[PDB]
C-alpha cells in the first residue's frame, strides 16, 4: 500500500537491487560456471512473502 511501514519499505529496496542481470565480465573468469541469474524475481511471477 501507500502506507509503507518503513521496515517493510526497507525490504522492498533490497528486493529490487537484487533483481538485476549478471555483469558481462563475470562470464569470462577462467573457471567460471555462472551463466545467468537463477534468482530472478518478477512481480507477475513470485511473491516476496512480506
Amino acid at each position: 500500500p501507500s502506507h509503507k511501514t518503513f521496515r517493510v519499505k526497507q525490504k522492498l529496496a533490497k528486493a529490487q537491487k537484487q533483481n538485476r542481470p549478471i555483469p558481462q565480465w563475470i562470464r569470462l573468469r577462467t573457471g567460471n560456471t555462472i551463466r545467468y541469474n537463477a534468482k530472478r524475481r518478477h512481480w507477475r511471477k513470485t511473491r516476496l512473502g512480506l
Binding site: 518503513f6 519499505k9 526497507q10 522492498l12 529496496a13 533490497k14 529490487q16 537491487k17
Partner: protein, 52 residues
C-alpha cells in the same frame, strides 16, 4: 534535517532556509536544501561543489 543543515555549514559553508528530505525507493536519502536568497546557488555549485 538538523544534522544535514549543520553539516552543510561546516562542509561547504552553506546557509539554508529550509530542507526537505526523501527516502528513495532504493534505500538512500535525498535532501533538497533551499539556499538563502542573497547567495547564488549556481555560482556555489561551480566553485565549492564542482557541479558545473
Amino acid at each position: 534535517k538538523a544534522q544535514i543543515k549543520q553539516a552543510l555549514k561546516k562542509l561547504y559553508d552553506i546557509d539554508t532556509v529550509k530542507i526537505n528530505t526523501l527516502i528513495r525507493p532504493d534505500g538512500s536519502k535525498k535532501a533538497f536544501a533551499r539556499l538563502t536568497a542573497d547567495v547564488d546557488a549556481l555560482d556555489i555549485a561551480a566553485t565549492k561543489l564542482g557541479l558545473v
